[PDB]
Amino acid sequence: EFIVGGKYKLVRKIGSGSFGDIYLAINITNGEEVAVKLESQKARHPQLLYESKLYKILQGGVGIPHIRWYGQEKDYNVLVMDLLGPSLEDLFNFCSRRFTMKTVLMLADQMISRIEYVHTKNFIHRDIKPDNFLMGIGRHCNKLFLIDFGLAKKYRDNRTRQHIPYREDKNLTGTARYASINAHLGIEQSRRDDMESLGYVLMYFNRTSLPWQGLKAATKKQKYEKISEKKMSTPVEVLCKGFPAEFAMYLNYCRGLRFEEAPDYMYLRQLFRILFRTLNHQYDYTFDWTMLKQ
């Protein structure tokens, strides 16, 4: 019944977002399965045209999905792209909200590289969370993809490499759970903030929960005042207690970066790679979920 781009028939809803929903679609000419992000024209929070533009710039990177078609069909804006596997949050749930140090470290390697690529293309993601990291399908089943570029912002000019100005008085962009301390203070986000958010994501897989997770308040404005103050009252050493020193080294490095300063991605990958070696682990792509399916 609902065909987009002249050849992609919608099968069923497989997700959602600020813009609208994500559907499983089938190419009626050959059986190919794709994902179709659908957004109402006259939607409260539009991002699909912006995402379509941002996927043009990011095309070529590994772990960056391929876009088939962007256009309109009825009263919707349509983004047709690669059908990817489950998110890290889906896999975390599947693994009973528990990941081994081997999974966290194999994931960490790919997550630094995925953010790094976006940064080489002059953009910051601003919504680093387990839900935006998805494993691929078939051939790409051990390849992790960073998706959802609706909050992505340019941090520097492509030719001059001039960094964006330092601002304060900014309302928080993205989820409060993995937001950096400076993003909470209203300070303008840059490369360092994507990296710091990644540290929270890893600590969240390490400890079932985060110290500021179970903090309830009536309104969202009150919900953040607690998270922000809990993040600031929690020393990195307290958050990372009982875990390898590398996790604290990672968060301390990121929080130590200057606004316009480039993260040393090699250093951060090396911290985890040297730890992985020390723990006598191999990069055999046997994750925790791989095992539950065995």
């Binding site: 028939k9 190419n27 009626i28 000419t29 050959n30 059986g31 190919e32 399965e33 391929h66 059908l83 399908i137 078939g138 051939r139």
Partner: protein, 381 residues
């Protein structure tokens, strides 16, 4: 090598047994006829070739119901320019099987047609209903006598019937073409225009593709043999149109042998330079040969060439058995690594005991026959 080559020809993925017709309709040679065209058919049909169709649109369904009551014959245009719907030639298609279904409150008609007669398009007229009719001229099939018929000595007439195949063919050529010494040319030249010799040269290449014997499977009539081979040659539309324009079986057989020898590589049509497979990987998984037309669930027809190995292809998704044209095999969409154009599907066995365990089905529309080294393209005869 144990699948059951009789399976793809049955088109079992289409469902329940269709209603069958026994009658046959043939138009007089050189006669002018007005025949309807099916709007979404994009294939270049060869006489004797099976064409399955799934018709969804009310206008298409209605047109077929009318044909099933009249002569059951529609015109299949060989499009020179598919975009502007340009055609100079084409082939008639006779419906021999049909099934009407009321799937999801909508009337759907599944059809099996066969290529009958070649034609020259004289006029194309789209009517006030949106359905178009073709004013056509039926192209005759040129049958020539033996090249020696006009050059044989009457005393050697009783030697023209003849009783290690190489030694046999050597004696065939010496006796059949003895009277070539009354002409300007040698025996070996006449052999190059001899139906039986040309068909035996083709059979040698067809045996390289399938282990079924000539004895039964392959026709004895040069016309039928030449059309059967033309239907399963993986060539582009420009070459297939030229092949369809041939009226003599001798010229058709010669032209096929030349394509079979020249075009050893098969590239992506969009890339033109990206190699997908070679003729050495071509094999028959169907009685028809290595390539046949199949219809998908939404009525898209693909002439699918079965090959053992293919390169420069990425697999999209996971395997599926849903609407599989080769029962017992699951399909996975295969795209070109460079341009991401759909090339075909990889077929993987569902049972461990099955052979082959894997192969590729490539859609003819996506491929481009290539001459190795550096040269253009030409089809002699």
């Amino acid at each position: 090598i144990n699948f059951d080559t009789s399976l793809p020809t049955s088109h079992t993925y289409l469902g329940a047994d269709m209603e069958e017709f026994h009658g046959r309709t043939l138009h007089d040679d050189d006669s002018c006829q007005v025949i309807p065209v099916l709007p979404q058919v994009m294939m270049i049909l060869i006489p004797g070739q099976t064409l399955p169709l799934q018709l969804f649109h009310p206008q298409e369904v209605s047109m077929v119901r009318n044909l099933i009551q009249k002569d059951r014959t529609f015109a299949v245009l060989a499009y020179s320019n598919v975009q502007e719907r340009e055609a100079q030639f084409g082939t008639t298609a006779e419906i021999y099987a049909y099934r009407e279904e009321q799937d999801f409150g909508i009337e759907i008609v599944k059809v099996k047609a066969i290529g009958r007669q070649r034609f020259k398009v004289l006029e194309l007229r789209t009517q006030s209903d949106g359905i178009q009719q073709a004013k056509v001229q039926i192209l005759p099939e040129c049958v020539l006598p033996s090249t020696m018929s006009a050059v044989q000595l009457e005393s050697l007439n009783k030697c023209q019937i003849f009783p290690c195949s190489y030694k046999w063919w050597q004696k065939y050529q010496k006796r059949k073409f003895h009277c070539a010494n009354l002409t300007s040319w040698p025996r070996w030249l006449y052999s190059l225009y001899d139906a039986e010799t040309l068909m035996d040269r083709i059979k040698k290449q067809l045996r390289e593709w399938d282990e079924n014997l000539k004895d039964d499977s392959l026709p004895s009539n040069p016309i039928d043999f030449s059309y059967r081979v033309a239907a399963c040659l993986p060539i582009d539309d420009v070459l297939r149109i030229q092949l369809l324009k041939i009226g003599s079986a001798i010229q058709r057989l010669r032209c096929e042998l030349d394509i079979m020898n020249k075009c050893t590589s098969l590239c992506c049509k969009q890339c033109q330079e990206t190699e997908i497979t070679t003729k050495n990987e071509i094999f028959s998984l169907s009685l028809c040969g290595p390539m046949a037309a199949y219809v998908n669930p939404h009525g898209y027809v693909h002439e699918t060439l079965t090959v053992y190995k293919a390169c420069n292809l990425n697999l999209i998704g996971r395997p599926s058995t849903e609407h599989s044209w080769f029962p017992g095999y699951a399909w996975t969409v295969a795209q070109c690594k460079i341009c991401a154009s759909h090339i075909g599907w990889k077929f993987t066995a569902t049972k461990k005991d099955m052979s082959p365990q894997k192969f590729w089905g490539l859609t003819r529309s996506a491929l481009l026959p290539t001459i190795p080294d550096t040269e253009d393209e030409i089809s002699p005869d």
